[PDB]
Amino acid sequence: RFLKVKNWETEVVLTDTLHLKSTLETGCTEYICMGSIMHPSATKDQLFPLAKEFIDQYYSSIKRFGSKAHMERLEEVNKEIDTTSTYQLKDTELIYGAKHAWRNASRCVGRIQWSKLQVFDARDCTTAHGMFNYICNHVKYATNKGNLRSAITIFPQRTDGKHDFRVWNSQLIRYAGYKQPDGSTLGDPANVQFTEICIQQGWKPPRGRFDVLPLLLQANGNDPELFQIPPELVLEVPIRHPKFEWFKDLGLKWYGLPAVSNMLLEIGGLEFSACPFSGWYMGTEIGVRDYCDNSRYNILEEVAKKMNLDMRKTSSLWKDQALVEINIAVLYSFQSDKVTIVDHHSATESFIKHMENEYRCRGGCPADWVWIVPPMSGSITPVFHQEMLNYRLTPSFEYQPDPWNTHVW
Amino acid sequence: CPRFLKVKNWETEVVLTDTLHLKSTLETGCTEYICMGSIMHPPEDVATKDQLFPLAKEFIDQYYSSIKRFGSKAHMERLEEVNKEIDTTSTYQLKDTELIYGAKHAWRNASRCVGRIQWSKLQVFDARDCTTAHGMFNYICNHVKYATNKGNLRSAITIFPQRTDGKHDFRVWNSQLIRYAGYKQPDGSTLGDPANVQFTEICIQQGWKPPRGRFDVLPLLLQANGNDPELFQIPPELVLEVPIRHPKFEWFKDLGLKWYGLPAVSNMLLEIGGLEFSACPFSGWYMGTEIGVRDYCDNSRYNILEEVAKKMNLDMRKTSSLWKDQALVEINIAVLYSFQSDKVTIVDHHSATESFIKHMENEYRCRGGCPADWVWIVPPMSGSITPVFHQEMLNYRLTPSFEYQPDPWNTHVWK
Numbered sequence: 001r002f003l004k005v006k007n008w009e010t011e012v013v014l015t016d017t018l019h020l021k022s023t024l025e026t027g028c029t030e031y032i033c034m035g036s037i038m039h040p041s042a043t044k045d046q047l048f049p050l051a052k053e054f055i056d057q058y059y060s061s062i063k064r065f066g067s068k069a070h071m072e073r074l075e076e077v078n079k080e081i082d083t084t085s086t087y088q089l090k091d092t093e094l095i096y097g098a099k100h101a102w103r104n105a106s107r108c109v110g111r112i113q114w115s116k117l118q119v120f121d122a123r124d125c126t127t128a129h130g131m132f133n134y135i136c137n138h139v140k141y142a143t144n145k146g147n148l149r150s151a152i153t154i155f156p157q158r159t160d161g162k163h164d165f166r167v168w169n170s171q172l173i174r175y176a177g178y179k180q181p182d183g184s185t186l187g188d189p190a191n192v193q194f195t196e197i198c199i200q201q202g203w204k205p206p207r208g209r210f211d212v213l214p215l216l217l218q219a220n221g222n223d224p225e226l227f228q229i230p231p232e233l234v235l236e237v238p239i240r241h242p243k244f245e246w247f248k249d250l251g252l253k254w255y256g257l258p259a260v261s262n263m264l265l266e267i268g269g270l271e272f273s274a275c276p277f278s279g280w281y282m283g284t285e286i287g288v289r290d291y292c293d294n295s296r297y298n299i300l301e302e303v304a305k306k307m308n309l310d311m312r313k314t315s316s317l318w319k320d321q322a323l324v325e326i327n328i329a330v331l332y333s334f335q336s337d338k339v340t341i342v343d344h345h346s347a348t349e350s351f352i353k354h355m356e357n358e359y360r361c362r363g364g365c366p367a368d369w370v371w372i373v374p375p376m377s378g379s380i381t382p383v384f385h386q387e388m389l390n391y392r393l394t395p396s397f398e399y400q401p402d403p404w405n406t407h408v409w
Numbered sequence: 410c411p412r413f414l415k416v417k418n419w420e421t422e423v424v425l426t427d428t429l430h431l432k433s434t435l436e437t438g439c440t441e442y443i444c445m446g447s448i449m450h451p452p453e454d455v456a457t458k459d460q461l462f463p464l465a466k467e468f469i470d471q472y473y474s475s476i477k478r479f480g481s482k483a484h485m486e487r488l489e490e491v492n493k494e495i496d497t498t499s500t501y502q503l504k505d506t507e508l509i510y511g512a513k514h515a516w517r518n519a520s521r522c523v524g525r526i527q528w529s530k531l532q533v534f535d536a537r538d539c540t541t542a543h544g545m546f547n548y549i550c551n552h553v554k555y556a557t558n559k560g561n562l563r564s565a566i567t568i569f570p571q572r573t574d575g576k577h578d579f580r581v582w583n584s585q586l587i588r589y590a591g592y593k594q595p596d597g598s599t600l601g602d603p604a605n606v607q608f609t610e611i612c613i614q615q616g617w618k619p620p621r622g623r624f625d626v627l628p629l630l631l632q633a634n635g636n637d638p639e640l641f642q643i644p645p646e647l648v649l650e651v652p653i654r655h656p657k658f659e660w661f662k663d664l665g666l667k668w669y670g671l672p673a674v675s676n677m678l679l680e681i682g683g684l685e686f687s688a689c690p691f692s693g694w695y696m697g698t699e700i701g702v703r704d705y706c707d708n709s710r711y712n713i714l715e716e717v718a719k720k721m722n723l724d725m726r727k728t729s730s731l732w733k734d735q736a737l738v739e740i741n742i743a744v745l746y747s748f749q750s751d752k753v754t755i756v757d758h759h760s761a762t763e764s765f766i767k768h769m770e771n772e773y774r775c776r777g778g779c780p781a782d783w784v785w786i787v788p789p790m791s792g793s794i795t796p797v798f799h800q801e802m803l804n805y806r807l808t809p810s811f812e813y814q815p816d817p818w819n820t821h822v823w824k
């Protein structure tokens with residue numbers, strides 16, 4: 001059936017037809033909704049229909065469905081799955097597939113940009129040194145001296161599952177975290193385990209509060225190897241406040257490049273287990289989650305001190321006041337340093353515009369309200385009031401197991 | 410369906426196990442292929458004899474389980490008596506004990522409510538003997554007075570007679586017992602609460618003389634036994650109101666804001682053992698953000714961010730200055746301060762969400778789960794600095810329950 005989504009602020013109703021194209025499960029049933037669950041629950045035989053479906057939609061998008069090129073491609077893929085139990089994507093198909101995995105990513109508020117994605121083909125890579133080279137070039141290109149550019153680098157697909165390419169870092173650029181003798185934690189507490197895996201592999205930690213982790217790279221199922229990203233490639237921003245001159249003395253910094261490296265890109269039944277991709281930050285990612293999550297850098301109490309706020313009762317909203325100032329600082333700092341960043345008002349506004357675009361030209365836009373609504377000031381952004389439908393379209397970005405749980409050394 | 414479902418808290422790493430979902434009784438709107446978790450709402454006839462039997466037995470079984478008398482002589486007798494009632498009259502009547510149990514559990518089961526730690530402390534007023542709109546008015550006035558308690562709010566529900574053939578419904582036409590009027594002007598501006606223009610126009614048609622002010626309490630529009638609804642003014646002394654001021658900004662009181670103390674939902678349907686109570690107004694107390702963020706700062710509501718931003722002398726040219734967010738916090742500080750100062754019960758969103766987590770954990774432990782709607786439970790400001798943001802939740806529908814129902818002006822057959 002045709003499903004309707006309403007905006008309760010504008011009373012705009014949109015009609016979703018696109019959902020009729022899904023086949024992958026959401027996790028929900030008619031009786032139980034798993035909308036807030038973060039991670040809900042090949043062979044030649046399985047591979048061809050998937051390949052067939054992807055090839056069909058590719059030639060549908062370039063308006064040549066049933067064409068000779070289309071027919072020959074379908075035949076081509078058949079013989080190759082037949083004789084090798086896999087197949088290789090054409091360049092045009094790789095690029096199409098990567099852009100549409102982004103386009104279909106229901107948890108991403110940045111998708112108005114989806115067709116502007118620089119795709120780096122790294123499928124000829126064979127070694128960790130090779131991966132390091134490709135990743136360094138990605139970082140340099142994407143960073144672009146502050147004028148950030150969306151990019152994805154795609155390493156060889158899975159074959160037998162014993163020769164996977166993996167970036168072991170969850171993101172390309174992150175700060176180390178150290179368990180202190182006295183029980184506390186220096187740096188990013190979320191990364192303590194990974195940091196210690198790096199130390200155990202020979203990494204000499206500076207034991208500072210913002211130490212860029214090394215890359216840990218696995219090529220063709222081999223033991224991973226360590227590499228330091230050259231520092232001039234790692235763009236960082238000191239955080240200061242436009243009114244509070246004491247804010248710089250907190251000693252805060254962050255990296256300019258958000259780059260997810262632990263996901264799996266699926267295209268036409270092929271699995272790309274190493275596909276680091278990057279964009280630019282929304283301010284709240286740093287200001288709210290990275291800095292103020294209790295399990296992260298956790299700086300609210302400190303900032304509240306310097307603001308001289310009364311912190312005895314929660315109903316003074318002292319946390320809320322500190323939160324807003326921290327996020328003002330982050331936006332101000334990046335902007336002052338000419339580093340691309342978007343505030344959550346601008347981003348969610350762009351997303352509503354994007355949704356409208358997709359409903360008109362595509363018949364829908366899969367979207368995960370739980371992830372799209374920002375972690376602060378939710379209802380004064382327009383996505384809070386926007387009904388969204390969530391469903392799974394392929395090509396897609398999927399989660400995969402942590403490498404350190406499925407790798408025989 | 411799997412017998413055990415796990416939910417994780419991503420801040421504390423606490424994992425909880427849900428078995429209660431197995432008792433799910435009707436549908437969420439989601440399917441295997443689409444999730445409607447952010448959809449707000451995903452024939453004038455009634456339940457037949459055959460439909461009512463299993464629904465009644467299900468509820469009676471559950472009641473006698475709760476009082477540790479499952480399988481008792483009293484249990485088997487009640488089943489038999491209920492079965493006879495449905496067989497001869499094609500409906501049945503709940504005992505007072507069962508009515509109270511059912512109401513408390515409809516609240517316990519309400520997946521969109523963050524205040525459920527309080528669910529067993531609910532004063533139930535049995536108004537099933539009511540026959541006229543004047544009588545409904547008396548019952549509602551007593552509810553308001555009891556629940557308000559001079560500012561020491563007490564949660565309460567008043568239950569009017571159940572549905573019979575569908576042509577004799579009791580309805581409160583008001584969506585909430587206490588709301589402010591909205592007035593659309595010829596030039597397109599709105600006075601008062603813009604959300605309430607439609608209902609306000611209905612009241613005016615029915616004979617209400619409008620003060621045409623910014624905070625005019627609407628009259629009750631009460632429908633008894635399927636008759637045309639009738640208008641009543643709640644005695645102003647029963648409507649507790651709080652003027653909004655700010656502990657630091659002396660100019661904040663100059664905005665002339667106030668709000669009412671008692672949040673009371675009156676447009677929902679209470680379903681117990683297959684019986685349908687189409688008029689069941691219930692009330693609790695406010696969480697500050699309901700007023701401070703939604704009523705005051707929604708663009709479609711009172712929309713005061715701009716005016717407050719100006720008085721705060723904020724740079725309002727770039728959104729990236731977060732002037733809106735800064736004003737939002739100050740407005741919500743003002744609301745909590747004004748309620749506390751006047752000793753009217755209110756809870757801040759930090760306290761409420763912390764209590765809810767403790768509640769949820771206790772429910773998983775004693776009941777095997779706690780259905781919760783994340784989209785509704787997480788507050789409309791500062792989401793991730795509240796613990797519920799990081800809590801995975803399962804949403805499913807248990808009965809007894811509160812359900813939505815059509816607006817009565819859309820369905821009513823005028824006499």
Ligand code: HEM
Binds near residue numbers: 098117281
């Ligand atoms: C260009 C600017 C972009 C912006 C402003 C943006 C914004 C965001 C934000 C705020 C999130 C939530 C992140 C979190 O809470 O962990 C997110 C998630 C996500 N983004 Fe985007 N993004 C951008 C680019 C991209 C690109 C280039 C891709 C892929 C080619 C992408 C794919 C995804 C995916 C798959 C997620 C979900 C991640 C997960 O499930 O953990 N995004 N995005």
Ligand code: HEM
Binds near residue numbers: 512527531694699756
């Ligand atoms: C006692 C203090 C209570 C608190 C602090 C509280 C808190 C809340 C809040 C903040 C909401 C969201 C309302 C909205 O955004 O429109 C809500 C919804 C709800 N509450 Fe509670 N509540 C309380 C009492 C009650 C009682 C006494 C009942 C019923 C007996 C109840 C049943 C419900 C229901 C059914 C909803 C969903 C309303 C809808 O779908 O529009 N609550 N509650």
Ligand SMILES: CNCc1ccc(-c2cncc(CCc3cc(C)cc(N)n3)c2)cc1
Binds near residue numbers: 171173174277280282
């Ligand atoms: C439970 N949460 C654990 C967690 C903690 C941190 C991160 C994370 C760390 N560093 C960077 C990110 C970037 C997310 C992102 C990706 C992209 C492409 C754009 C963007 N704005 N933001 C995410 C992810 C997950």
Ligand SMILES: CNCc1ccc(-c2cncc(CCc3cc(C)cc(N)n3)c2)cc1
Binds near residue numbers: 008691695
């Ligand atoms: C689409 N949203 C429209 C809408 C607008 C206003 C209201 C509303 C108006 N006045 C009062 C409320 C109270 C909701 C509530 C009920 C209860 C029992 C407790 C509580 N804290 N809050 C809700 C509900 C819905």
Ligand SMILES: C[C@H](O)[C@H](O)[C@H]1CNc2nc(N)[nH]c(=O)c2N1
Binds near residue numbers: 449
């Ligand atoms: C579209 C979305 O479902 C809608 O705006 C919801 C979001 N969450 C909410 N949460 C609460 N408590 N109250 C609401 O009215 C809403 N509105």
Ligand SMILES: C[C@H](O)[C@H](O)[C@H]1CNc2nc(N)[nH]c(=O)c2N1
Binds near residue numbers: 801
């Ligand atoms: C339990 C819940 O699903 C989890 O905390 C989610 C909520 N929404 C989120 N939204 C974004 N953008 N990122 C997140 O990590 C989360 N975490």
Ligand SMILES: [Zn+2]
Binds near residue numbers: 035
């Ligand atoms: Zn769902």
